[PDB]
Curated annotation (Swiss-Prot):
Name assigned to this protein: Protein SIS1
Role of this protein: Required for nuclear migration during mitosis. It is required for the normal initiation of translation. Might mediate the dissociation of a specific protein complex of the translation machinery. Essential for viability.
Domain J: 7-73
Subcellular location: Cytoplasm; Nucleus
Disulfide cysteine pairs (residue numbers): none
Note: Present with 20300 molecules/cell in log phase SD medium.
Gene that encodes the chain: SIS1
Residues of the full protein shown: 2 to 81 of 352
Assembly and interaction partners: Interacts with polyadenylate-binding protein PAB1.
């Protein structure tokens, strides 16, 4: 895909590189899931879900763009949902 995003963290959340292929995503996902697994004492469930969400944002041109423009918080919210 096109890396039209602000941060390449989306790839880091999948444990893959910008030009990663499907095989990379699968193996990286297991690595990332092993990294942000809720078994970790901090209990990062949001980060575990963020793994999939990152790919979903990266795989979706709408949220991909929103990520570039505003960032992850906006992209994951489906837009600049930042009220006063």
């Amino acid at each position: 895909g096109m890396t039209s995003v602000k941060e390449t963290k989306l790839y880091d959340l999948l444990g893959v590189s910008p030009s990663a292929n499907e095989q990379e995503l699968k193996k990286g996902y297991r690595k990332a899931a092993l990294k942000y697994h809720p078994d970790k004492p901090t209990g990062d469930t949001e980060k575990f879900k963020e793994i999939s969400e990152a790919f979903e944002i990266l795989n979706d041109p709408q949220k991909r763009e929103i990520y570039d423009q505003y960032g992850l918080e906006a992209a994951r919210s489906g837009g600049p949902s930042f009220g006063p």
